[model samples]
Target: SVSEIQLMHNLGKHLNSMERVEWLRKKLQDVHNF
Candidate 1:
């Protein structure tokens, strides 16, 4: 749905730092799995 996809993009926006990217990557992976 638009809502979930929109929030997923929002979660991917904080890629400014390595740790941030890694952290978000895990979350992105989890959501993608879902």
Candidate 2:
């Protein structure tokens, strides 16, 4: 879902601000996990 991607983008930015580099990286990796 393209709309679902918005959630990821938001999460990425939030994670980045939180200094959750590893979490952001892992989130990106899991983006295509399905």
Candidate 3:
């Protein structure tokens, strides 16, 4: 349960608006690069 909670917390932090948007842009760029 503790490990699961930590995993969810980390996931939530990265999935916040700024992080998610930057990740999305980077992924799109990666797709275009390919």
Candidate 4:
């Protein structure tokens, strides 16, 4: 669900404010690959 994604996006900020959004994008890709 995209809503679940939105939740992750929100968490990503709190998780690592310094990291690029691309970092999170790759994480999601890895999850799907698994």
Give the Cα lDDT of each candidate: 0.80, 0.84, 0.90, 0.84
Which one is best on lDDT? 3
**lDDT score for residue 30 of model 4:** 98
Off by over 4 Å in 1: 1-16
TM-score of 1: 0.45
Model 1: per-residue lDDT, tens digit, 1-34?
5999988777776544667778889999999998
lDDT of candidate 3 over 1-32, digit per residue (tens): 59999999988887797787998999999999
- List clash counts for every candidate, in order: 0, 0, 0, 0
Writing each residue's lDDT as its tens digit, candidate 2 over 1-34 gives 6888998999988977878777787898899794
lDDT of 4: 0.84
Two-way lDDT contest, 2 vs 3, winner: 3
* RMSD of each candidate relative to the true structure: 12.5, 12.3, 5.8, 11.8
TM-score of each: 0.45, 0.48, 0.49, 0.41
For model 4, the superposed segments whose C-alpha errors exceed 4 Å read: 1-19
Q: Write the per-residue lDDT of candidate 4 for residues 1-34, one digit (tens) a residue.
A: 5999999999987768647676988899999998
The Cα RMSD of model 3 versus the native structure comes to 5.8
Clashing pairs in 1: none
